[PDB]
């Protein structure tokens, strides 16, 4: 990974009409499809489920075709209410009648390790070293490199997690702020600690459904059925948000800058989603974007096992469960926003968090 500064060079960079985001997206699709080919397919598990209350969790009993095909075995499993839909007490796994669920393989970690991007022969990568560079326009001084820095391919919705901090100042970017269909990216120059956890004491049970195919389910939670929560500190947050407010005063006509919760939509976009240790969290952010001292801003979260991110018609993903509890400490280094329109007058601009359009997470 060699770097060499290029003196007296100015180039017109463009973060939005780039191609490495459109290649990173397709390469994430390709690797996630390749890595889930030698894994279990839960097409035999699309059966009627006798589900009762154990809360958001349902104790579901159902029967399966075991390893000996002419014998049927009754088994039990704890499924969240978001992972099942009714058809009474009869349910089926969500997205069975539209998609082919594929269990994420155990003993193959899906950790977002840092990924460098090295240019091929005959090409080069220019990096812009200007600290206040928003993403578009000229750069003061650039550097040719072989391989980019370690880019963790994180998955998020409303808060960019484990990203690269801005060096000196908060960096705000859009294609055109007066256009409202275009997500506004905001890079924090100061990380905000966020510690989050699933406190349930799960016990994983293995279910054999075929020749070497195993289906891992939750079963028999021990102790209190507690709620997954996502803590942020009210100290550093709203300080960083006041800084963001100050910076967004200048990039528009003078108006009061203040924040609203997310609009209606799929729990995939109305809540800050991510992926912690293979467990998919969906934490509501209504407590962050609704209007100042030390404390904690504890956010309710909903765990979802059957999730279909980067929406491919006909595919899903059963994320297997983990025994014990887990904890999720990360560094918020970014923030995705959007702007409500209309002739609302009163000189206040309402910014809501925005989700979907996953390429934005790698534009940052």
């Amino acid at each position: 990974p060699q770097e060499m500064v290029l003196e007296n060079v100015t180039e017109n960079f463009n973060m939005w009409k780039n191609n490495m985001v459109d290649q990173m997206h397709e390469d994430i699709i390709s690797l996630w499809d390749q890595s889930l080919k030698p894994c279990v397919q839960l097409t035999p598990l699309c059966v009627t489920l006798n589900c009762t209350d154990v809360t958001g969790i349902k104790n579901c009993s159902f029967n399966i075709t075991t390893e000996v095909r002419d014998k049927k075995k009754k088994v039990h499993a704890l499924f969240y209410r978001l992972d099942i839909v009714p058809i009474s007490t009869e349910y089926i796994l969500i997205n069975c009648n539209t998609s082919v669920i594929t269990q994420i393989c155990p003993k193959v970690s899906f950790d977002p390790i840092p990924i460098h991007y090295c240019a091929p022969a005959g090409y080069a990568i220019l990096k812009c070293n200007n600290k206040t560079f928003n993403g578009t326009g000229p750069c003061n001084n650039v550097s040719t490199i072989q391989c980019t820095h370690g880019i963790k391919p994180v998955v998020s919705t409303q808060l960019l997690l484990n990203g690269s901090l801005a060096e000196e100042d908060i960096i705000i970017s859009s294609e055109n702020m007066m256009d409202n269909t275009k997500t506004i990216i905001v890079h924090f120059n100061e990380s905000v600690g966020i510690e989050c956890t699933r406190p349930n004491n799960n016990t994983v049970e293995s279910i054999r459904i075929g020749p070497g195919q195993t289906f891992y389910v939750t079963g028999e939670i021990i102790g209190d059925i507690r709620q997954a929560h996502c803590n942020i500190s009210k100290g550093n947050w709203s300080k960083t948000l006041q800084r963001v407010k100050e910076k967004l005063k200048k990039y528009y006509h003078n108006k009061t800058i203040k924040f609203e919760p997310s609009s209606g939509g799929d729990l995939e976009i109305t809540t800050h989603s991510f992926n912690c240790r293979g467990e998919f969290f969906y934490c509501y952010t209504s407590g962050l974007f609704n209007e100042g001292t030390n404390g904690t801003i504890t956010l309710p979260c909903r765990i979802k096992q059957i999730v279909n991110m980067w929406q491919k018609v006909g595919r899903a993903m059963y994320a297997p469960p983990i025994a014990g509890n887990i904890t999720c400490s990360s560094n918020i280094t970014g923030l995705l926003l959007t702007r409500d329109g209309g002739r609302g007058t009163n000189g206040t601009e309402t910014f809501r968090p925005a989700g979907g359009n996953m390429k934005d997470n790698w534009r940052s």
Partner: antibody, heavy 126, light 106 residues
Framework: VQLRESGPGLVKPSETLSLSCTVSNDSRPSDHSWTWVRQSPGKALEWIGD???????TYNPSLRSRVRIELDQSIPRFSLKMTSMTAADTGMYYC???????????????????????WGQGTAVT | ELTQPPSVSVSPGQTARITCSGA??????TYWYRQKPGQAPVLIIS???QRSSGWSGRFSASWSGTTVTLTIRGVQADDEADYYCQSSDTSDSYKMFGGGTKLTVL
């Protein structure tokens, strides 16, 4: 934990009853809801209402117009002002400590009452 | 509104089933208290844990539908006292007691 009450006792009709309640030997008064109940002779217990150290208060739906509840006064104290009390509705008044066992983040409603764990000596009022 | 029978009678050494029924009890815990004549009430059935709802002693509680039964193994003459159930409404708006049951020992 002990609860000790103090009031006039001899209360006539169309007068405002007042009964303060000192709390002694309690390490964490913040984590227990404090409530008043009453028992007249030959009748079941009637719930007046409860308060918390956060400030949340909730009264009985068909007694609230008469009663209000007081707050902390350094020494852990809470009282009961019952305007327009009649001699047709008397009884034996009890302080009570609806304890709270917290099992998770208390902001998210992750708590449940242990019940009226400790009871005061009680005072009869007219 | 809660309601329970006025009285239950059982001889020494056997078991009495004081029953308490009402509307909110299908969703909320049912606490129980014991009151002597003159003496202050005490806590006999508590909610020690979120899920187990256990007990330690001769008293016990059984839940089914909209009715909760206080069950007292090993009745004695000392146990002759009034028994009051409590439930905390559909939401956390107000606590409320039952009509009380006087257990008499034959």
């Amino acid at each position: 934990v002990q609860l000790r009450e103090s009031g006039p006792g001899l209360v006539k009709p169309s007068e405002t009853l007042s009964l303060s309640c000192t709390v002694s030997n309690d390490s964490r008064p913040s984590d227990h809801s404090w409530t008043w109940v009453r028992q007249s002779p030959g009748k079941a217990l009637e719930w007046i209402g409860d308060i918390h150290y956060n400030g949340a208060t909730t009264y009985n739906p068909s007694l609230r117009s008469r009663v209000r509840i007081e707050l902390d006064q350094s020494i852990p104290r809470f009282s009961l002002k019952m305007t327009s009390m009649t001699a047709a509705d008397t009884g034996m008044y009890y302080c009570a400590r609806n304890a709270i066992r917290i099992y998770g983040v208390v902001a998210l409603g992750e708590w449940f009452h242990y019940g009226m764990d400790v009871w005061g000596q009680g005072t009869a009022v007219t | 509104e809660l309601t329970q029978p006025p009285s239950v009678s059982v001889s020494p050494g056997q078991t009495a089933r004081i029953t308490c029924s009402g509307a909110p009890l299908t969703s909320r815990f049912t606490y129980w208290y014991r009151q002597k004549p003159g003496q202050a009430p005490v806590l006999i059935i508590s909610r020690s844990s979120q899920r187990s709802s256990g007990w330690s002693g001769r008293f016990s509680a059984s839940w089914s539908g909209t009715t909760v039964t206080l069950t007292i193994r090993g009745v004695q003459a000392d146990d002759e006292a009034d028994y009051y159930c409590q439930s905390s409404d559909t939401s956390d708006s107000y606590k409320m007691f039952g009509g009380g049951t006087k257990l008499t020992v034959l």
